[PDB]
Design a protein around this ligand. Structure first.
Ligand SMILES: [Cl-]
Ligand SMILES: [Mg+2]
Lengths: 483, 5
């Protein structure tokens, strides 16, 4: 066509030509002769108000891989008709290819596995852009150290070296650790790292007391790395500790660091070595029992927990585990009786009603579970040191949130209040943050939710990605509602 | 969705 002469025909005749030129373009597109584009341009010169011509041009650029031209032409289609289905999906498809996942998800949302694919791509892009010196929550630290005999651990620092200038700092580190307080863990973490650095220097005139104190510093600085999820850092120090002076703790800790869902043969051989070094050490049996428990080997778990109990009968944790095993074995009555007998011995410890409340919740006795968590919270408030920390708040808030919308606005507000308090009392709890974030999102407090989801991701690899995913999904909802 | 109109 000479478009010169066509443009000077009538409006019926000029449009008629558009339908005719468009159709010629379509013939070529079907014949994989995309350079189609020329005929559509011709059509545009006669009818620039037709979004089909721009949308068709963009289908050609999809076919030849010009992703930037796809965006330009689908955009032109969409500026005429913002709800054009093919333009929206083509533009989302090209944006995904260019790595503009939020733009893709936006158009896919307006259009309505594709959404989910781009969400994942966005979460990994953001996780990779973003990404430890950060401890787990004080609640989780108190639980981890609950089995150990503080006095024994603090007194295991040797005061008799002629060269050791770090032992007093090491002693303060352990003192702080076993105070089981928010300040205690932060100070322990600081001073263990400092003691280890001093020990590396000292090791380089050395004597055996200094070697054993170094092994002790290395052993705890190692488990702190494990707790921070720096597994290689942990293994390096634990191995150094073993190379200096083998101890049951260093074997327990190295086993935890190298634990393997596939083969648990190595885990159990470390524990045999720990047993050999000291067959009269309660935490060895307790931790091995924990692993048999996790592997659902209840007979062997019971044996080990009974051994831990028989070596340190003043520690509440072996009793609790034994009661939990009864419940898992299919014996609630006997479990409840064991918890009650344990509550008689340890009437001030919140560990007993907190673990029992978890069993009640599993049974669906939510009202009794909440009463147990109420008691646990009061017992916890009265103690100087952390026992169960924010566990009861999270426990009760989770029940109340699920009961509220299964809206009971009083239970839902109560849950918010509980999780808000939990977040303030234990700022490094990702559990508390994510819990609160989901409720904020239900209330359409999107900005608040996003901040909580993002903090949780800082705090939490698959966990970091899950939190990042919640945050990125919420940012898209925010963008949609903004327009 | 891959077809011209
Ligand atoms: Cl030695
Ligand atoms: Mg926690």
């Amino acid at each position: 066509p000479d478009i010169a002469q066509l443009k000077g025909l009538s409006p019926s005749q000029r449009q008629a030509y558009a339908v005719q030129l468009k159709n010629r373009g379509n013939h070529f597109f079907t014949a994989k002769n995309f350079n189609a584009i020329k005929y559509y341009q011709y059509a545009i010169e006669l009818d620039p108000n037709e979004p089909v011509f721009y949308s068709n041009i963009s289908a050609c650029y999809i076919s030849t891989g010009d992703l930037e031209k796809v965006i330009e032409f689908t955009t032109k289609a969409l500026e005429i008709k913002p709800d054009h289905s093919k333009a929206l999906l083509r533009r989302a498809s090209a944006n995904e290819s260019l790595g503009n996942f939020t733009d893709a998800m936006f158009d896919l949302s307006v259009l309505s596995p594709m959404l989910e694919r781009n969400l994942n791509k966005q979460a990994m892009k953001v996780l990779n852009e973003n990404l430890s010196q950060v401890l787990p929550s004080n609640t989780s630290l108190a639980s981890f150290f609950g089995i150990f005999d503080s006095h024994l651990e603090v007194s295991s620092v040797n005061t008799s070296s002629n060269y050791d200038t770090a032992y007093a700092l090491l002693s303060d580190a352990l003192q702080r650790l076993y105070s089981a307080t928010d300040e205690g863990y932060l100070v322990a973490n600081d001073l263990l790292t400092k003691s280890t650095d001093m020990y590396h220097s000292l090791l380089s005139t050395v004597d055996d007391p200094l070697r054993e104190n170094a092994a002790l510093a290395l052993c705890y600085t190692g488990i702190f790395h494990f707790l921070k999820n720096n597994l290689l850092d942990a293994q390096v120090l634990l191995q150094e500790s073993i190379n200096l002076h083998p101890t049951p703790n260093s074997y327990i800790f190295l086993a935890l660091t190298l634990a393997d869902k596939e083969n648990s043969q190595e885990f159990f051989k470390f524990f045999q070595k720990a047993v050999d070094l000291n067959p009269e050490y309660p935490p060895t049996y307790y931790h091995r029992g924990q692993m048999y428990f996790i592997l659902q080997d209840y007979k062997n778990a019971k044996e080990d927990f009974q051994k831990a109990q028989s070596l340190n009968p003043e520690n509440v944790y072996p009793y609790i585990q034994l009661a939990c095993l009864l419940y898992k074995q299919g014996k609630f009555t006997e479990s409840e009786a064991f918890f009650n007998e344990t509550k008689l011995k340890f009437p001030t410890l919140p560990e007993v009603p907190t673990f029992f409340a978890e069993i009640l919740t599993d049974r669906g006795d939510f009202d009794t579970a909440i009463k147990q968590y109420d008691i646990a919270k009061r017992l916890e408030e009265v103690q100087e040191k952390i026992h169960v920390g924010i566990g009861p708040l999270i426990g009760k808030a989770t029940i109340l949130a699920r009961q509220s919308s299964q809206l009971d606005e009083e239970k839902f507000n109560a849950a918010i209040k509980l999780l808000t308090k939990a977040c303030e009392l234990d700022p490094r709890s990702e559990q508390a943050k994510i819990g609160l974030a989901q409720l904020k999102l239900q209330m359409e407090k999107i900005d608040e939710a996003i901040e909580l989801f993002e903090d949780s991701a800082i705090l939490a690899m698959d966990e970091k990605l899950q939190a990042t995913t919640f945050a990125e999904a919420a940012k898209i909802q925010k963008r949609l509602r903004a327009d | 969705m891959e077809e011209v109109d």
